């Protein structure tokens, strides 16, 4: 075993948030448990989450983590006998551009839903007499599109509150920028303050390498041997679903081919159609692995 | 729904204060509730507000917001059970160029209205024995003109006081600059310290996108079916007004056309004139939306 | 009324101290009430004031104003009910060349 | 049972006296039994109570409780079997800023009603030859405004006397403040020395959680068959009351709606006005609870 | 809450009926009332998801003294009592310490 093998570095596990967006929701919105759609695994944002739009590229988005802990020191012991960590404070800041309603509500700590534009559209946002403690739900989701197989990397913060506001300089050659810092608090219902998540076809490729679950070894077609009908109807077509030993659905990743297209014609998504009565073998192959399933077509 | 659609970024909502103006008024002036003229939506500054003139470009105008708050901490709770925010202190600073009476009064904290120029125009301004607590009313109005449509974004501070004054350096290649910081206080009569507002045809375009009120869907002609007279008089002409479902007057935005200019000739502003007796259809079209109104011309 | 008219900017009111001099007098000298000659409005310096000559160009002359104040804070008021400004301290510095 | 459930801690029961004020009245004034307006539950100060104006912030208001205790110990026991609280002295102190007549009268233990200003307004207040033992009635009422539903928490002391006065230091940068300590005595007419009370919409929300009375579970309404008149007159409007099972009026808290606005138009306060003859349904809802009434309208 | 206020004022407020709009008034007794309570002071130490509950049982506690209250426009109102433990005849002890 040499040094390269010992290191076992994998550049494919380095994810770059090539695009990024911050979505804010009112505290009455049900928090997002995940951004992966159960139907097809695509990016699914729960209703009520509204994006804040563009933000400054050079500033980026900064995440900050801080620990407060007390050490219990005993006589004769150089090291603490117990470290009591109270909390892990998480904050994030960024410089948003757009002058839209939720952005302005966040920066002014006031609900502007009752604000009505004038006869000509003008609005006046009056700051509250005393700033309000307004909590939000935040999704910080970024996309790394890698060979048309994107990876979506997100942070879920069910409870975020404005902490501080940066100075706002107006320059005749720049747009208005709002630079708030948002601090995350623990939400009792969901039982966490910050949750980091990964999704997308690229992440599906990279899960086993990253070390979550188990490495894929074989592909198993759950429908097994389905039956379709030449006549049009509910039994005219059947949908196949292939999984792995690790429990991951590899249907988008595999390639659906039919040995006898005359009997059961298979599509890329995995739909077999009863063209003519007989038997057809659907062979789904992903990389070296493959799985064969017989489909019976009846008149 | 892809990442781009989820982000839903709208660069048109990014506003750059291409030009800026600082208007100061004595504390006896009635504060500006809005900068929008009720008659036509144009920029209207109340009497008593006088601009400070040119200010330094590189420094720009800096706005600063600070929150003071106390957190109530309970036993066993890492996060505060209640945050009491006292106030949101707002300040703005800029570097004025012009040696005007209002600028000098602001920087010397003294009323120089009684100062009389000498026989040859010379004046001498004396700093007061004790600096005075003088309050002003401030308007910070900025213009961003996009495609011949301006957006005026402004900050109204009914009560501003000189907090600190930066050092003045005299250089044989530079003008005299006065760099004051002005702190905003709460005016009890108007009930706020800072108010942010938008106005202009560009803002009228961008209100629905920004998320205030409701999206425009149809245009309605408030006069409906008016009657004019061929003879000159009060009834010779009629003025039309068109409003969207959201309550915004789109008269400048729409285009006024007449199907029968011989009977009721329509102008761009929306004035129908009784050229000849009959009936004429005025069709005001804005984008895809349109509204038709019949005008009856009598002898 | 447009934005340009509202601003009413006037570059002629920007004054650049192209030349500058500091004249010092003993404390027994009668202070100068004005530098304007009553006869014709020309620059008139009272006797006893003597210039310190040349000073460094890059350093320039720097003026500085500082305020010391105490805020009387009342219960329930985020803002002070009164501000007492004791004084306004003014200073100026420059780099003299002549000996 | 888990620790959090056993603790059952509520943050809403923590009340912060955000704005406190002190009201003094002469001993002849009828004592304040409560500060809750009988008609609408608003803040109602009895006549004769006059505020002392602003007072110092850093000093705050300090309420001091002093217990005189006696230990009863038995012959056959090592520790005292019982303790007796013979008396409980209540005092409160604060630092008033204003120089008004009632403040000065309290400070000097003199009645300055007969002090007539001189020709130019100057007044001279002489301390009495012998200090005078004067009693007042005190109201210490504080407001905690949360979500525009203030909680008024107050202390009523029907009989207070100046116990001691703190030394006052004159400083050329500070206003002159008078810092008295007032001791509370038991008033024979009302039977108590100090009382503590709560009021306001926030307290109406929090009574059930605090544990006074019974929890709100049934939302009953005023007799649900009211007769109203379309024509203007005595019976053209009818007022509805919304009560809970615990004898608390929840009319301001509930939301009034009319299923048939043509018959009876309902206001926010709960006034149904007869507009067209027939029958209407009026519904007042609060959270899960609701109440309904069938209103008859006659022409 | 009611039990906190009852402890502070040495009064039983079970008969206090809120007014028509929820307001309550808690008058102090003419003579302070010598009322005894039973106290459980239970603390939880979470270690490796295996909590330790350490508790003090005081079957008889009485309000010995009450600290001064300061009203500050930036702090909530806190009531700071001191409670003295007495020996209960039925259980035979005044204070006990336990673990679970």
Tab-separated table of C-alpha atoms in Angstrom, chain B:
chain	number	residue	atom	x	y	z
B	1	UNK	CA	-39.307	23.088	-11.829
B	2	UNK	CA	-35.599	23.707	-12.363
B	3	UNK	CA	-33.082	25.697	-10.334
B	4	UNK	CA	-33.446	28.803	-12.509
B	5	UNK	CA	-37.228	28.834	-12.056
B	6	UNK	CA	-36.848	28.238	-8.314
B	7	UNK	CA	-34.439	31.176	-8.046
B	8	UNK	CA	-36.784	33.399	-10.092
B	9	UNK	CA	-34.258	36.226	-10.214
B	10	UNK	CA	-35.350	39.579	-11.679
B	11	UNK	CA	-32.472	41.955	-12.412
B	12	UNK	CA	-34.993	44.705	-13.187
B	13	UNK	CA	-35.686	44.881	-9.447
B	14	UNK	CA	-32.065	45.944	-8.892
B	15	UNK	CA	-32.084	49.747	-8.640
B	16	UNK	CA	-28.946	51.886	-8.897
B	17	UNK	CA	-29.142	55.427	-7.469
B	18	UNK	CA	-27.526	57.010	-10.515
B	19	UNK	CA	-28.191	60.476	-9.099
B	20	UNK	CA	-28.755	61.481	-5.484
B	21	UNK	CA	-30.042	64.541	-3.652
B	22	UNK	CA	-30.153	65.490	0.027
B	23	UNK	CA	-32.843	68.003	0.994
B	24	UNK	CA	-32.844	69.548	4.464
B	25	UNK	CA	-35.640	71.533	6.083
B	26	UNK	CA	-36.014	73.310	9.427
B	27	UNK	CA	-37.822	71.432	12.170
B	28	UNK	CA	-40.805	73.786	11.821
B	29	UNK	CA	-41.498	72.526	8.288
B	30	UNK	CA	-44.344	70.068	7.855
B	31	UNK	CA	-42.711	66.672	7.188
B	32	UNK	CA	-42.953	65.031	3.783
B	33	UNK	CA	-45.360	62.098	3.893
B	34	UNK	CA	-44.569	61.110	0.298
B	35	UNK	CA	-42.623	62.430	-2.679
B	36	UNK	CA	-45.306	61.457	-5.210
B	37	UNK	CA	-47.450	64.251	-6.606
B	38	UNK	CA	-51.153	63.367	-6.204
B	39	UNK	CA	-52.011	65.103	-9.485
B	40	UNK	CA	-49.749	63.160	-11.853
B	41	UNK	CA	-47.356	61.020	-9.797
B	42	UNK	CA	-44.330	63.191	-10.563
B	43	UNK	CA	-41.645	64.097	-8.041
B	44	UNK	CA	-43.038	66.712	-5.645
B	45	UNK	CA	-40.926	68.095	-2.796
B	46	UNK	CA	-42.810	69.988	-0.061
B	47	UNK	CA	-41.909	73.655	0.451
B	48	UNK	CA	-39.163	74.315	2.971
B	49	UNK	CA	-36.945	71.419	1.869
B	50	UNK	CA	-33.740	72.849	0.396
B	51	UNK	CA	-31.091	70.733	-1.301
B	52	UNK	CA	-27.533	70.787	0.042
B	53	UNK	CA	-26.166	70.743	-3.505
B	54	UNK	CA	-23.274	68.669	-4.776
B	55	UNK	CA	-21.526	66.160	-2.541
B	56	UNK	CA	-18.433	64.011	-2.938
B	57	UNK	CA	-18.664	61.142	-5.416
B	58	UNK	CA	-16.198	58.542	-4.119
B	59	UNK	CA	-17.545	58.633	-0.568
B	60	UNK	CA	-21.145	58.470	-1.721
B	61	UNK	CA	-23.826	58.448	0.946
B	62	UNK	CA	-23.533	55.815	3.669
B	63	UNK	CA	-26.553	54.540	5.606
B	64	UNK	CA	-25.992	52.701	8.872
B	65	UNK	CA	-28.460	50.755	11.016
B	66	UNK	CA	-27.690	49.504	14.525
B	67	UNK	CA	-29.850	47.388	16.833
B	68	UNK	CA	-29.610	47.499	20.620
B	69	UNK	CA	-31.297	44.596	22.375
B	70	UNK	CA	-31.207	42.654	25.628
B	71	UNK	CA	-31.726	38.890	25.703
B	72	UNK	CA	-33.586	37.300	28.616
B	73	UNK	CA	-31.856	34.006	29.405
B	74	UNK	CA	-33.547	31.214	31.353
B	75	UNK	CA	-31.955	28.236	33.063
B	76	UNK	CA	-31.349	25.284	30.768
B	77	UNK	CA	-32.209	27.202	27.590
B	78	UNK	CA	-29.283	27.854	25.212
B	79	UNK	CA	-31.322	30.438	23.308
B	80	UNK	CA	-32.970	33.501	24.875
B	81	UNK	CA	-36.624	33.102	25.772
B	82	UNK	CA	-37.257	36.725	24.747
B	83	UNK	CA	-35.229	39.388	22.948
B	84	UNK	CA	-36.174	42.960	23.871
B	85	UNK	CA	-35.065	45.329	21.111
B	86	UNK	CA	-35.029	48.938	22.287
B	87	UNK	CA	-34.433	50.925	19.101
B	88	UNK	CA	-33.016	50.813	15.585
B	89	UNK	CA	-30.556	53.695	15.333
B	90	UNK	CA	-30.215	54.998	11.773
B	91	UNK	CA	-27.454	57.327	10.591
B	92	UNK	CA	-26.365	58.686	7.234
B	93	UNK	CA	-23.177	60.464	6.211
B	94	UNK	CA	-22.012	62.295	3.093
B	95	UNK	CA	-19.415	64.898	2.107
B	96	UNK	CA	-20.907	68.219	0.992
B	97	UNK	CA	-19.004	70.595	-1.303
B	98	UNK	CA	-20.984	73.836	-1.385
B	99	UNK	CA	-20.557	76.640	1.151
B	100	UNK	CA	-24.257	77.412	1.446
B	101	UNK	CA	-26.120	78.847	4.404
B	102	UNK	CA	-27.899	75.575	5.191
B	103	UNK	CA	-24.691	73.518	4.981
B	104	UNK	CA	-22.807	75.958	7.206
B	105	UNK	CA	-25.707	76.108	9.672
B	106	UNK	CA	-25.725	72.313	9.849
B	107	UNK	CA	-21.981	72.045	10.430
B	108	UNK	CA	-21.820	74.902	12.970
B	109	UNK	CA	-25.073	74.045	14.821
B	110	UNK	CA	-26.218	77.658	14.615
B	111	UNK	CA	-28.920	79.640	12.829
B	112	UNK	CA	-27.242	82.133	10.476
B	113	UNK	CA	-30.437	83.769	9.214
B	114	UNK	CA	-29.582	86.981	11.084
B	115	UNK	CA	-26.121	87.162	9.488
B	116	UNK	CA	-25.862	90.218	7.249
B	117	UNK	CA	-23.145	90.547	4.598
B	118	UNK	CA	-20.861	93.539	5.013
B	119	UNK	CA	-20.617	96.505	2.645
B	120	UNK	CA	-18.579	94.388	0.202
B	121	UNK	CA	-20.383	91.080	0.756
B	122	UNK	CA	-18.073	89.580	3.366
B	123	UNK	CA	-19.624	87.437	6.089
B	124	UNK	CA	-18.233	86.033	9.339
B	125	UNK	CA	-19.874	82.998	10.948
B	126	UNK	CA	-19.201	82.510	14.661
B	127	UNK	CA	-19.514	79.145	16.346
B	128	UNK	CA	-21.963	79.357	19.272
B	129	UNK	CA	-20.751	79.510	22.853
B	130	UNK	CA	-22.401	76.123	23.445
B	131	UNK	CA	-23.340	73.854	20.511
B	132	UNK	CA	-27.089	73.792	19.940
B	133	UNK	CA	-29.410	70.807	19.545
B	134	UNK	CA	-30.940	71.617	16.155
B	135	UNK	CA	-33.195	69.119	14.391
B	136	UNK	CA	-33.959	69.005	10.674
B	137	UNK	CA	-36.171	67.118	8.246
B	138	UNK	CA	-34.228	65.125	5.662
B	139	UNK	CA	-35.140	63.700	2.269
B	140	UNK	CA	-32.615	61.444	0.538
B	141	UNK	CA	-34.007	61.086	-2.987
B	142	UNK	CA	-32.200	59.127	-5.690
B	143	UNK	CA	-33.030	58.759	-9.368
B	144	UNK	CA	-32.382	55.741	-11.602
B	145	UNK	CA	-33.563	56.522	-15.140
B	146	UNK	CA	-33.999	53.354	-17.212
B	147	UNK	CA	-35.146	53.646	-20.836
B	148	UNK	CA	-36.645	57.133	-20.374
B	149	UNK	CA	-38.603	55.906	-17.331
B	150	UNK	CA	-37.235	57.076	-13.958
B	151	UNK	CA	-37.417	55.365	-10.588
B	152	UNK	CA	-37.168	57.679	-7.584
B	153	UNK	CA	-36.190	55.838	-4.407
B	154	UNK	CA	-36.144	58.000	-1.309
B	155	UNK	CA	-35.609	57.942	2.435
B	156	UNK	CA	-37.694	60.276	4.596
B	157	UNK	CA	-36.271	61.125	8.024
B	158	UNK	CA	-38.543	63.678	9.729
B	159	UNK	CA	-36.037	64.339	12.537
B	160	UNK	CA	-32.267	64.379	11.944
B	161	UNK	CA	-29.550	65.788	14.190
B	162	UNK	CA	-25.828	66.285	13.682
B	163	UNK	CA	-24.115	63.429	15.534
B	164	UNK	CA	-20.444	63.742	14.566
B	165	UNK	CA	-18.323	65.731	12.126
B	166	UNK	CA	-15.351	64.278	10.270
B	167	UNK	CA	-11.977	65.991	10.047
B	168	UNK	CA	-11.507	68.669	7.390
B	169	UNK	CA	-8.225	68.514	5.473
B	170	UNK	CA	-7.258	71.496	3.323
B	171	UNK	CA	-5.256	70.546	0.228
B	172	UNK	CA	-4.081	73.002	-2.423
B	173	UNK	CA	-5.648	70.711	-5.050
B	174	UNK	CA	-9.063	69.998	-3.511
B	175	UNK	CA	-12.229	71.826	-2.493
B	176	UNK	CA	-13.515	72.258	1.055
B	177	UNK	CA	-15.569	69.224	2.084
B	178	UNK	CA	-17.883	69.051	5.090
B	179	UNK	CA	-18.515	65.452	6.188
B	180	UNK	CA	-21.267	65.292	8.824
B	181	UNK	CA	-22.978	62.223	10.193
B	182	UNK	CA	-26.702	62.751	10.777
B	183	UNK	CA	-28.615	60.544	13.207
B	184	UNK	CA	-32.344	60.004	12.733
B	185	UNK	CA	-34.758	60.209	15.663
B	186	UNK	CA	-38.437	59.355	15.960
B	187	UNK	CA	-40.883	62.156	15.198
B	188	UNK	CA	-43.988	61.643	17.324
B	189	UNK	CA	-46.358	63.444	14.947
B	190	UNK	CA	-45.536	61.304	11.906
B	191	UNK	CA	-44.737	58.303	14.098
B	192	UNK	CA	-41.531	57.066	12.474
B	193	UNK	CA	-37.811	57.737	12.192
B	194	UNK	CA	-37.046	56.430	8.679
B	195	UNK	CA	-39.369	55.648	5.778
B	196	UNK	CA	-38.273	54.114	2.477
B	197	UNK	CA	-40.339	54.846	-0.612
B	198	UNK	CA	-40.387	54.291	-4.358
B	199	UNK	CA	-42.074	56.236	-7.143
B	200	UNK	CA	-42.001	56.909	-10.861
B	201	UNK	CA	-43.138	55.212	-14.069
B	202	UNK	CA	-40.418	52.581	-13.690
B	203	UNK	CA	-41.680	51.732	-10.227
B	204	UNK	CA	-45.219	51.625	-11.605
B	205	UNK	CA	-43.925	49.010	-14.036
B	206	UNK	CA	-42.125	47.075	-11.292
B	207	UNK	CA	-44.661	47.148	-8.412
B	208	UNK	CA	-46.359	43.846	-9.253
B	209	UNK	CA	-43.011	42.121	-9.774
B	210	UNK	CA	-41.737	43.562	-6.482
B	211	UNK	CA	-44.752	42.017	-4.777
B	212	UNK	CA	-46.825	44.937	-3.475
B	213	UNK	CA	-50.557	44.751	-4.074
B	214	UNK	CA	-51.768	42.470	-6.865
B	215	UNK	CA	-50.617	41.675	-10.383
B	216	UNK	CA	-52.252	43.717	-13.129
B	217	UNK	CA	-54.722	41.642	-15.153
B	218	UNK	CA	-57.149	43.995	-16.925
B	219	UNK	CA	-57.683	47.693	-17.604
B	220	UNK	CA	-60.955	49.502	-16.881
B	221	UNK	CA	-61.967	52.952	-18.123
B	222	UNK	CA	-63.400	54.858	-15.160
B	223	UNK	CA	-65.279	57.535	-17.205
B	224	UNK	CA	-66.984	54.703	-19.092
B	225	UNK	CA	-69.074	56.349	-21.818
B	226	UNK	CA	-68.621	60.146	-21.807
B	227	UNK	CA	-70.417	62.820	-23.815
B	228	UNK	CA	-68.785	65.816	-25.494
B	229	UNK	CA	-70.097	68.752	-27.518
B	230	UNK	CA	-69.062	69.946	-30.971
B	231	UNK	CA	-69.429	73.524	-29.738
B	232	UNK	CA	-66.594	74.970	-27.676
B	233	UNK	CA	-67.169	74.966	-23.936
B	234	UNK	CA	-66.818	72.947	-20.763
B	235	UNK	CA	-68.402	69.948	-22.516
B	236	UNK	CA	-66.247	70.318	-25.649
B	237	UNK	CA	-63.633	67.900	-24.267
B	238	UNK	CA	-63.541	65.036	-21.779
B	239	UNK	CA	-60.585	63.530	-19.912
B	240	UNK	CA	-60.295	59.746	-19.643
B	241	UNK	CA	-58.787	57.740	-16.788
B	242	UNK	CA	-57.795	54.068	-16.984
B	243	UNK	CA	-57.082	51.904	-13.944
B	244	UNK	CA	-55.916	48.338	-13.460
B	245	UNK	CA	-57.485	45.726	-11.229
B	246	UNK	CA	-54.774	46.396	-8.629
B	247	UNK	CA	-55.887	50.028	-8.316
B	248	UNK	CA	-53.018	51.653	-10.243
B	249	UNK	CA	-53.730	54.442	-12.728
B	250	UNK	CA	-52.112	53.432	-16.033
B	251	UNK	CA	-53.079	56.543	-18.017
B	252	UNK	CA	-49.463	57.517	-18.887
B	253	UNK	CA	-48.605	53.899	-19.714
B	254	UNK	CA	-51.530	53.186	-22.062
B	255	UNK	CA	-51.815	54.499	-25.634
B	256	UNK	CA	-54.967	56.409	-26.584
B	257	UNK	CA	-56.327	55.690	-30.070
B	258	UNK	CA	-59.658	56.673	-31.624
B	259	UNK	CA	-61.468	54.522	-34.177
B	260	UNK	CA	-63.318	57.614	-35.477
B	261	UNK	CA	-61.088	60.691	-35.079
B	262	UNK	CA	-63.647	62.704	-37.067
B	263	UNK	CA	-66.152	62.514	-34.191
B	264	UNK	CA	-64.128	62.427	-30.947
B	265	UNK	CA	-60.422	63.068	-31.496
B	266	UNK	CA	-58.312	61.518	-28.729
B	267	UNK	CA	-54.912	62.800	-27.615
B	268	UNK	CA	-51.989	60.901	-26.120
B	269	UNK	CA	-52.744	62.132	-22.595
B	270	UNK	CA	-56.355	60.968	-22.877
B	271	UNK	CA	-58.355	64.039	-23.895
B	272	UNK	CA	-61.253	63.446	-26.299
B	273	UNK	CA	-62.406	66.492	-28.267
B	274	UNK	CA	-65.778	66.860	-29.967
B	275	UNK	CA	-64.762	67.510	-33.569
B	276	UNK	CA	-68.072	66.345	-35.058
B	277	UNK	CA	-71.315	64.840	-33.797
B	278	UNK	CA	-71.524	61.055	-33.719
B	279	UNK	CA	-69.930	58.201	-31.792
B	280	UNK	CA	-66.255	57.303	-31.460
B	281	UNK	CA	-64.557	54.332	-29.801
B	282	UNK	CA	-61.414	55.089	-27.790
B	283	UNK	CA	-59.307	51.931	-27.456
B	284	UNK	CA	-56.542	52.285	-24.864
B	285	UNK	CA	-54.027	49.454	-25.280
B	286	UNK	CA	-51.158	48.686	-22.898
B	287	UNK	CA	-49.105	45.662	-23.873
B	288	UNK	CA	-51.517	42.819	-24.515
B	289	UNK	CA	-54.258	44.373	-22.373
B	290	UNK	CA	-56.789	46.798	-23.821
B	291	UNK	CA	-59.976	48.658	-22.937
B	292	UNK	CA	-62.641	50.152	-25.213
B	293	UNK	CA	-64.860	53.108	-24.311
B	294	UNK	CA	-67.546	54.784	-26.412
B	295	UNK	CA	-67.750	58.585	-26.567
B	296	UNK	CA	-70.894	60.352	-27.776
B	297	UNK	CA	-70.471	63.741	-29.470
B	298	UNK	CA	-73.571	65.935	-29.649
B	299	UNK	CA	-74.086	69.249	-31.434
